[PDB]
Amino acid sequence: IIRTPETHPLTWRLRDDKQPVWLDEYRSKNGYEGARKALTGLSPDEIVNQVKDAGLKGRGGAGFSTGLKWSLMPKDESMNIRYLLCNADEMEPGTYKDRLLMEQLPHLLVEGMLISAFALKAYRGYIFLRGEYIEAAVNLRRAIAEATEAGLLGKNIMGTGFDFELFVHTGAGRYICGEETALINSLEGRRANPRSKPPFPATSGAWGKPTCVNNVETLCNVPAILANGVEWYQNISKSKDAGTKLMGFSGRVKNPGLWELPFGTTAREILEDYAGGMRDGLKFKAWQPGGAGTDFLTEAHLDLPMEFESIGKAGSRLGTALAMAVDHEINMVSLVRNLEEFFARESCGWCTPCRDGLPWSVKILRALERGEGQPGDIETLEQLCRFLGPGKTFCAHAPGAVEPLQSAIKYFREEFEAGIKQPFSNTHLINGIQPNLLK
Amino acid sequence: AFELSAAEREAIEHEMHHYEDPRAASIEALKIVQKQRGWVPDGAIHAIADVLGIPASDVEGVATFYSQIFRQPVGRHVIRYCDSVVCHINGYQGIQAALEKKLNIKPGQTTFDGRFTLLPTCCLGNCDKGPNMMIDEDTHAHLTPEAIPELLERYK
Amino acid sequence: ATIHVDGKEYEVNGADNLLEACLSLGLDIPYFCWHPALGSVGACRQCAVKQYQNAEDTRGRLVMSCMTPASDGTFISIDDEEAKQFRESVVEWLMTNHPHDCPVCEEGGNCHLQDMTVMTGHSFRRYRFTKRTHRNQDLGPFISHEMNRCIACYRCVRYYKDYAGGTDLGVYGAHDNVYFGRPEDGTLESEFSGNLVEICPTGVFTDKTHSERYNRKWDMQFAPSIC
Amino acid sequence: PELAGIKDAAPDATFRIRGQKLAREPHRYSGRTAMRANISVHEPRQPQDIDTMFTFSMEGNNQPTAHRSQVPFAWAPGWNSPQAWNKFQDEVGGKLRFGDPGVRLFETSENGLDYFTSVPARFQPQDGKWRIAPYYHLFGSDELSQRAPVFQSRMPQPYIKLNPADAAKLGVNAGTRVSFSYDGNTVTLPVEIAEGLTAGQVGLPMGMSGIAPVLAGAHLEDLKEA
Amino acid sequence: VACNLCAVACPVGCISLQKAETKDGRWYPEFFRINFSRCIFCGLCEEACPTTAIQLTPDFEMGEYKRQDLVYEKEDLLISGPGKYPEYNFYRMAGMAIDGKDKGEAENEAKPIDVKSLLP
Ligand SMILES: Cc1cc2nc3c(=O)[nH]c(=O)nc-3n(C[C@H](O)[C@H](O)[C@H](O)COP(=O)(O)O)c2cc1C
Ligand code: SF4
Ligand code: SF4
Ligand code: SF4
């Protein structure tokens, strides 16, 4: 499938030989031209206004607009010490787009984050990459060397005079590091604990300085918006959400992978066209749109476009728009057990409900796996999910943790009741004491 | 008995001028010691605290918070098989059973000769080619239980 | 300021948080992670109250009273069923891994966790799985360590590091395996390490000098004196 | 008359809270008919307190709203922890209700002092004489605290602190026992090297056994290796 | 375990004891005395015992010649068997390490996981 730049402004310069694009080929295919336009004839506040007009939203899963985040910094010009972060952690399961992006296109991310720094007067930049991306780190370091030897980073960038430098910090294997405040805390060298709001990271981020963190996909969609105009970017997808998105399916399908699709595309159009359906003798039991932290959906929700507001009233979230399909052979009890086990062993453990209730749900699901369920387990799961909502915990990791649990409860309750076999026996008989027969 | 080498100290200092806070180089210093020795011993926490200036409690908390920084001694090669949801759909249970049959150990334990250490890990970013297994510099994909003895014999 | 607690009008300080304003009035709100001297971090999730936007609101919103400022005209409820259910659930989650140690614990009868378990009305156990255990460090001749009783409320690290300016007490590990103590065995080097026996709401840090010849708080003959 | 403020430090023995005294022990004080039963099965006298407003018994007052300032212990119904001080305060984290106990003897004077013109000279290290530098210890300086048996493991061993230059001059290393004579008595101590000390001084632990705190600021004679 | 719950639960206050600790860390009474001239035989101490150590037995013949000899010390109270509760042992449930029970060896307790362990 040929991806023209008119409707695919992100994946039109890709190579089919699985080889990275260096500085020469990137500069040949419209490299560092819009960045030159912004650094020469366009004010940083005008770039912020262009982002406002384009309606660029966050690609990390929250859906927050980039212009509102960029405009939340204070107007005090004395705070010149400013930091810009690229969230290349990709710690969410079921998401593999950033590895494929970084293995063949580092320079687009570098250019887009350079413009995002110039538009926000950010003097320092960091790419927070996960620690298991070895070849991605090697390619990123080689891109750093090639950009520094060409003058693209450092002092006197093409006569503009803007001082900027980028460093790459590798992760150390924790899922909670992906959150913005926790990424700021882990960048400072402390334990990756999130920070409550108030305060806000736009005011006091990294080391108290103004600091903004953007996703890799957002920082790669920025050059297309800046170079090919704003109204042209608005004229790509005709919906409430404007732009494109990296999309794809994974898990027991014919053609797993990554493609680029505009907003408003229905979820069925990736099944039989891009993925080509599943393997032999597999029934569509469930699917999950936005990685491990999103609600499961059924076949009735498959005919529904992948937007933010479209999934908003559907009882789920768009997430990273990298769905995963669960067939009839995989039981949902074991799947939810594995999801909650991941969310419990990779939780940060700050606040009481997630820290001391996710192991309870994990043990309940372990009992339901072995048939050792007891009457009072599913109700415990509902009570924990109700008491783990947005703001019921310290952050939003735990609402995303128990979104799959409540989704599998709502849609597949009959598979969970089959694990309840023995009656509720919490006490054991003590010889000499008559038990209190509760009714 | 611990002593940071000149190369390790130079690498830690080189990471230290990257950030404006010497505390920010704690994770990278721990990873440097991890690369240069294979694990972080008890004296390494105090050495990193002395070099950086932060207390040893902060370095110990950073080392014990992250899963990819090892505080207990491991073997020559570590095995980090993905056990997340997509690799569960792809069936990592057969891979884990084959690994436990070959190495004759438990997940989290090490072999008697220190040849391998069996560990689970988080998402490896390779869902489309699941299941995946992470050795020191390799991301093995499209795993089958029959190919596990063939894959484990190429590492010594 | 002016707050409406269960329909009753109360005059409080506007700069105070809601938990300290309600505690100053004699109203009982369960809390662990808040201390008057150490500030607030909102870890234990125990001080939930239902705040209403205006005078006539039905659903409200569950909020943390140690983060909520006591602004003028603030309508809250403490004894309504949703907030009590949430606080009982938080106490129950704290009680899942807590050891069966009250008779052989020096904090029995002097325990904040016992008081808040009783205050929330939680007395029936429905947890049947295993409970996590921890090895006990040696903290010297003054402080006795028992990490099974911890509820991960982060008051010790806050006091010892931020307040007391110590350097050899920290939190280690993640999720429910967080460990509070020194990196290795040794004496707590701070000159104010003894205040951990009152900062800690549980029996993790106990007076070892008292532990040698121990008696409960009700059996003690007290007098006000000067050191 | 300069100590005339100590009358207001606490009320006298006739002070009552609605007629009753202040209880020393809590309401659930136990074992009262058995704590002395091994000596005699007859219960003794409750000790009478003619000096203070307190009683050696249950029968008193410890209400958090009692109009008083001397609170023997914090206890409230449902608050058995040290968080009952919240009940005993007017506002939490503030003062004790009905005022904090204690009274300042003197107010701030209107007119101050004058500048002390006696500026001391520099410290000149003389040969043969060593200036004693006081090194106080939280466990070991107050005499009654050293008497406590639990402080004998927390206190450090008595080490005499020396400059590296002075240690080079005498030729003694760290840990070596050196003897010094003060007031005609020779005592030996092991040497610890202090880099932060200055030359011509010698560090000594004030308050320990044999080293009185009066030794601070005094000369020391015959510092030689034992 | 010398937890003093019986002594405070006694409405007459005729139980006196003191906590002592062995080298392995288990708790026991250094002494235990009951003033039986004061005891009303109400069974509140037995009801308040969390270890079922203190018990009231079917024995009424306790008449004495001297009132001082109605103070029963620990050597007169501790019997050779389990009494009316033959199987209960509190130290199988307590989460404090003694001889014969390390951490994690009590009922419904997992093995202690060190923070230096390799598991995620
Ligand atoms: C628990 C949690 C984990 C997250 N993990 C990642 C991640 O691994 N990679 C990523 O790019 N964003 C991740 N995010 C999203 C961002 O960290 C952040 O919440 C925000 O949505 C970023 O907005 P952006 O798309 O404009 O960059 C995570 C968010 C949460 C709440
Ligand atoms: S919800 Fe879980 S991950 Fe988030 S702050 Fe609370 S303990 Fe940490
Ligand atoms: S800390 Fe409190 S709740 Fe825990 S065992 Fe001790 S007295 Fe009981
Ligand atoms: S040891 Fe005590 S003060 Fe510290 S977190 Fe645990 S319960 Fe809180």
Ligand code: SF4
């Ligand atoms: S039975 Fe006797 S010793 Fe026991 S509580 Fe009653 S009066 Fe006290």
Ligand code: SF4
């Ligand atoms: S007899 Fe029972 S209630 Fe009394 S101190 Fe001993 S264990 Fe506690």
Ligand code: FES
């Ligand atoms: S789920 Fe295993 S590589 Fe992503």
Ligand code: FES
């Ligand atoms: S006291 Fe408010 S959450 Fe802890």
